[PDB]
Design a protein around this ligand. Structure first.
Ligand code: NA
Length: 101
């Protein structure tokens, strides 16, 4: 399935230091409405924190669910989330060594 992670960033003078694509009206890939990271800015908060990666999917911004929203609503959430932004993200979970069935 997926690996989930909570990542907390402090906003800087140039924001959070990443770009997003995706949204119900802006799919990154077919039939996926998710918000995905497309760019991490050198010297920005995301880069300096080290945890976020390109093509991570952002599911939540503080208390705002962004799993299935229009692009502008995700941008809005990220803009208005305040000085400390808690991101719930997911990415690929590598196959396990074994699975109990
Ligand atoms: Na929406």
């Amino acid at each position: 399935m997926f690996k989930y992670e909570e990542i907390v960033l402090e906003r800087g003078n140039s924001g959070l230091g990443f770009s997003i694509a995706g949204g119900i009206d802006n799919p990154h890939v077919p039939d996926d409405p998710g918000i995905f990271i497309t760019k991490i800015i050198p010297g920005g908060a995301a880069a300096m924190d080290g945890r976020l990666g390109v093509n991570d999917c952002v599911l939540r911004v503080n208390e705002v669910d962004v799993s299935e929203v229009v692009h502008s609503r995700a941008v809005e959430a990220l803009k208005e989330a305040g000085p400390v932004v808690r991101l719930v993200v997911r990415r690929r979970q590598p196959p396990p060594e074994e699975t109990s069935v």
